[PDB]
Structure formats: C-alpha cells, structure tokens
C-alpha cells in the first residue's frame, strides 16, 4: 500500500489544471529571462580610461624628450645600507627582497653622504650606488604627526577628573614647568600605560590633552606597526623614533598595543616573525637614546595581559594609570553632555537616570541618548520626554545586561 507512479499516471498530474495558460504563461517567463541574459552580453558597455592627459600640453612632451627619458635615463632600484668600512667603501646593502649584497658606490657621488640606513640608487647589473636618496621625508611620520587641532572640549570627559589630574600632572607639568623640579630637587616620571574596560575615556583623555598641548602630537595605529613584509615594520619604527626625537615638546600616543605586545620577559616570546621585529627595535630605541628626553609616549590597550615587565622596569614605563566607572556625579555629568546638544525637554532630571545605570560606560550612556531619540522618531515628536529616556534604559540595560527576571520581583519592596 505505497504505490509509485507509472508513466500514464504522470500524465494525470501534468494535464489537469489550466491546460490553456500553463505553458502559455510559463515560456513567456522562461524566454524573457533568457532575454535578460541576451541583452547583457549584447550590451557589454565597459570601457577603459588609462589616465591620459589633454594633448594641449603633452604633444611637445611626446617629442624626442620621451626617448631622452627612455635611453639616457635609467631604471635604478632603492635599498638600505647596513654599514660601511674605513678608507674604502665595501658597503653592505640589502635589497632584502632579493639578497643582501656587498657592493661599491659609483663614480658620480662622494663617499660622505652614504651613511647607514639610507635609501640609495642601485644599478641593475653592477649594483653600484648611483644616487643617495632621502628616507622619503616626511609622510612616514607627519601623516600621523598631524599637528592639527582636534574637536574635543575639555568639558567633554568630565566626571573622571582625578584620572585626568594624574595625566595632567604627568604630561603637562614637565613640558611647561620643569622649574619646581629644580626648586624641589626632583625629576618627572616618564612612563604611563593605560588599560581598563573598553569605551571608558581612553582615547578621549588622550585627545583632550592632544587638543590642549599647542604642540606636536602623534597617534599611532596598532595595526600599522604590523606589516606584510618581513623586516619592514622595524624599519618604520626606526624612522618614527628618529624623526620624532628631533623637534621638541611632542607627544606620541600608542593605541591597541595588543598586536605588538605580550610579555617578552616572561614565559612566552616564542614568536619572532615581524611582530618582534617591531617589538625588539622599539624597546631598543625606547631606552638607550632616551636619558632625559622631551617627548612623552603613552600606551593604551583593552587587554592587561600584554604588560611587559621589561617595560615596567623603570626607565621605560613607571605608572599604571587605569580608568574606572563614575560614581553617580560623573554619570550625571555625562548625561548632561550627550543631551545638551539635542532637542530635549527643559524639565527632565538626570540623577534619576544614573540611578538606573549602576555599572555602565559613557559609550553606553551615549547609546541611551541616541536610542531615546529613536523612540521620539517612532511617534511624531521633535522633543524628547522623560519616558523616552526611561524606555531607552529599559531597552539597553535591563534587556541585554546582567539583570533579568524582572516580573518575579516581590521580595524587595
């Protein structure tokens, strides 16, 4: 009692039910999708640009003064120099993508400005040094040494003023008053790392005093020190710490040092593939070239796993400044920050809100202020009410965070 379908039994299904419009509606839909294809290969519009110039100015350029750049001009490569020798060159040079070579200089130069760690012009066949070139100054530093005013007010990161007061004492007081250090007989600290929960004010307290420095400031991408090519990131961190120590009163901000970090004084450090090239070179140039400097460097990360005790050996890094949560008055200050710049009611109170935000960051406090506005968009409103924020705190904190089972309450009132 299962039966399967014979060939005549197939024809019962396939016939019954609109046998006038079945294929009539179907092959029209079938060949139109064929026709969607047949337009597309028929169109095939795609064309090139290839970046030419208008022929008003290049026709005389396209004369023999292209061949004068073809055959007289050359195709010389660039490299780096390890070192030199005395009274005779015997220079040691890496292509580093090809091999390392022991070469000579060509006759067109003087042996003075062929110093170590320099870009030079290298012959294709005889590999002689043709022209010494600059280290490509300066997009390797000044493109992150922006020297530009950021749009962060001092009143934006209010509520954590004592952690600011730690950082205001460490950074500002030697850079503008190294006089009471002489009047008392002390020297300033020169190492501070930042760690703690994400979205706490790390980049804010960095950028607020980067706004209040009137001076050189450098922000450093953590993945920028990670490179594709082996032996390339160390060469970069060479060029950063050299040309930042040149001018005075500058700040460098390391950020997300998880990729370049890890305890190298402790059990691990079994790495050594282009991460340690960056790492061993920076800890080389962090001390050694810094007794009694002028440029302070700050690190910041979300993971306190990657603390190096060799960094925390004094001379490199001294102080563990971490950030915390606001008690209440810090939070009520922050709610006033993220709600003064939007269409609100003049009668809401914010101390009721920070009661409902026990363990929360200003990232979450900002998220509530945006979410409460989103409830005002749901209805036709243009100003927020009290209950707009009250639904937002319920939507943010009492939904995904560490409190559930609200109806079974009945033990506490």
């Amino acid at each position: 009692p299962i039966r399967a379908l014979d060939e005549g039994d197939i024809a019962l299904l396939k016939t019954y039910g609109q046998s006038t419009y079945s294929r009539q509606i179907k092959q029209v839909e079938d060949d139109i999708q064929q026709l969607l294809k047949k337009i597309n290969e028929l169109t095939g519009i795609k064309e090139s640009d290839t970046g030419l110039a208008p022929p008003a100015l290049w026709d005389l350029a396209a004369d023999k003064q292209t061949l004068q750049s073809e055959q007289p001009l050359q195709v010389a490569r660039c490299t780096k120099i390890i070192n030199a020798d005395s009274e005779d060159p015997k220079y040691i040079i890496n292509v580093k993508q090809f091999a390392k070579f022991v070469v000579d200089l060509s006759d067109q130069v003087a042996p003075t400005d062929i110093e170590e760690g320099m870009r030079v012009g290298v012959d294709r066949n005889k590999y002689q040094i043709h022209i010494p070139l600059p280290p490509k100054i300066d997009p390797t530093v000044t493109m992150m040494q922006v020297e530009e005013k950021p749009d962060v007010t001092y009143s934006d990161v209010g509520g954590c003023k004592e952690q600011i007061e730690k950082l205001r004492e460490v950074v500002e007081t030697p850079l503008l008053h190294p006089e009471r250090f002489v009047n008392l007989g002390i020297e300033p600290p020169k190492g501070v790392l930042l760690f703690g929960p994400p979205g706490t004010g790390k980049t804010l307290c960095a950028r607020a005093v980067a706004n209040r420095t009137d001076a050189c400031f450098i922000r450093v991408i953590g993945s920028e020190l990670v490179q594709k090519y082996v032996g390339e990131g160390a060469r970069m961190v060479r060029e950063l710490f050299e040309m930042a120590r040149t001018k005075k009163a500058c700040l460098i901000f390391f950020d997300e040092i998880d990729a370049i970090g890890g305890a190298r004084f402790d059990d691990g450090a079994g790495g050594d593939n282009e991460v340690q090239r960056t790492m061993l070179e920076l800890i080389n140039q962090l001390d050694g070239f810094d007794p009694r400097g002028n440029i302070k460097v700050l690190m910041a990360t979300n993971r306190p796993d990657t603390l190096d005790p060799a960094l925390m050996r004094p001379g490199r890094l001294d102080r563990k400044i971490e950030f915390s949560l606001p008690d209440l008055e810090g939070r009520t200050h922050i709610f006033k920050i993220h709600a003064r710049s939007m269409s609100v009611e003049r009668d809401i109170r914010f101390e009721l809100l920070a009661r409902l935000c026990p363990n929360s960051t200003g990232a979450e406090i900002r998220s509530v202020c945006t979410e409460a506005g989103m409830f005002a968009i749901r209805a036709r409103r243009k100003i927020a009410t009290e209950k707009d924020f009250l639904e937002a705190v319920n939507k943010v904190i009492k939904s995904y965070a560490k409190f559930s089972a609200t109806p079974r309450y009945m033990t506490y009132n």
Partner: protein
C-alpha cells in the same frame, strides 16, 4: 558565577538558588483565580489523560479546611507535603482557638514554613507556588498567593504556570472596574480567560467555585460545556 549554595550572597546581592526555584514553577500547569461579589472561582488547565489510567489521582485543587481552597504549580512531590502539612495546621488552630481558620492565617503558615526551610544548607527549597482562595473570614472573599521565596501576597486576580504573563496582561484589559456580579458572569470571565489557554482545547478545563456558604463545587463537563457554548455564541454576536 557561584550558584551552588543557598547561604551565599552574590557581589550584587542575590540568592540565585532561591531564584532558580521559581524557574521550576514556570514548567507547571497554569491556574487562574478571581474573587467575585459573593462567589469566588478558580480554574486549572488540566493536561491530557494518557488513555490507560484513572484520573481521580491527578488532583490539583484541594481544600485545607471546609471553607478554604488551594491551587498550585511546580512539582507534585513538594506540593503534596505542603498540602498535608497545612491540613494539620488549620485543624490544630481550631483546637487551640475555637474559631474557624481565617484565610490570612493559613497563608502565613505556609509562607513561614517555606521561609525557615530556605535558610539551612541541605534543605532544597519548595519549588511550588500556591493560590489560596476562601470567602471564610466572616463573609469577606479573599485570595492570596505564595512564592518559593516565602512571601505571601494578596491580589484580586491571578495567574501562574507556563505563560501566565499572557494571562495577567489579558486580565488587566479584561477585569472591568465593573465588579462582575451575577456570578455566572464571573464564571464566564474565568472560562473566557482560560479560553486564552496555551492550547484551548475546550474539553481540558476544570473550574472550581465556592458560593461562600456551601462546600466546594467541582463543575461537571456538561455544565462547563454549556458555558463554553454561550461564550462562542455571544462572541459571534459582537461582529
């Protein structure tokens, strides 16, 4: 995340083992109950009989005294002890003090029994939640409930069991400011509320009423079938 002892506070101040007992309530059968003008009523959601057993031993509604009722959730092992204990206390009260037992006195006993049973290690708390209904205290209809934490508490309408949240939200839009007199109207409220059951088979409802002077009256599945018919009949007239 220590949830393995009952005498420990969380660092935000909780007792999770008390909180885990109330999750065991939510796997229990639903039961609702309102108080009326004179006649109180409660109803349960009875599960399907498995075709080969007697059904007089699946009792979910019991009476402690001659004038007070009881409906529970949770698990029947812990429910049987609390019922058997509270029958003694409402009887021993009558011996020591010659009155009948008020509905408020017996809920304080059940809550205090569940109270002192929480505090010591090696005493796993009662994972049930009770509904205590009785028009006993001198013609005054009352209904209370309990909680596995041991907090007795007074409502005017109630729902427990799986998906009681749907029923409690249903009653607030349904329990009128009009006190439903004409007590078949009040029974029609509960049968309509339990008609918003998790399944609403129609033949799976047991309602129990008390007209404040008689004994307990278990309804019959022909009279209860009459009230389900008029609910669908009056709902068709609303269109």
């Amino acid at each position: 995340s220590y949830d393995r002892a009952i005498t420990v506070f969380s660092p935000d101040g909780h007792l999770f083992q008390v909180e885990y007992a109330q999750e065991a309530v939510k796997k229990g059968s639903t039961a609702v109950g309102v108080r009326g003008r004179d006649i109180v009523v409660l109803g349960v959601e009875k599960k399907s009989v498995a075709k080969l057993q007697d059904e007089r031993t699946v009792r979910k509604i019991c009476a402690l005294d001659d004038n007070v009722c009881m409906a529970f959730a949770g698990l029947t092992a812990d429910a049987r002890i609390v019922i058997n204990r509270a029958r003694v206390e409402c009887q021993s009260h009558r011996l020591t003090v010659e009155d009948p037992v008020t509905v408020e006195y017996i809920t304080r006993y059940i809550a205090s029994l569940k109270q002192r049973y929480t505090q010591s290690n090696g005493r796993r708390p009662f994972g049930i939640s009770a509904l205590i209904v009785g028009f006993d205290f001198d013609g005054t209809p009352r209904l209370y409930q309990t909680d596995p934490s041991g907090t007795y508490h007074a409502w005017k309408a109630n729902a427990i069991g799986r998906g009681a949240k749907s029923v409690r939200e249903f009653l607030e839009k349904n329990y009128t400011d009009e006190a439903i007199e004409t007590d078949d109207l009040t029974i029609k409220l509960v049968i309509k509320a339990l008609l918003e059951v998790v399944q609403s088979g129609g033949k799976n409802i047991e309602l129990a009423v008390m007209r404040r002077d008689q004994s307990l009256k278990i309804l019959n599945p022909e009279e209860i079938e009459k009230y389900v018919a008029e609910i669908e009949k009056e709902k068709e007239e609303n269109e």
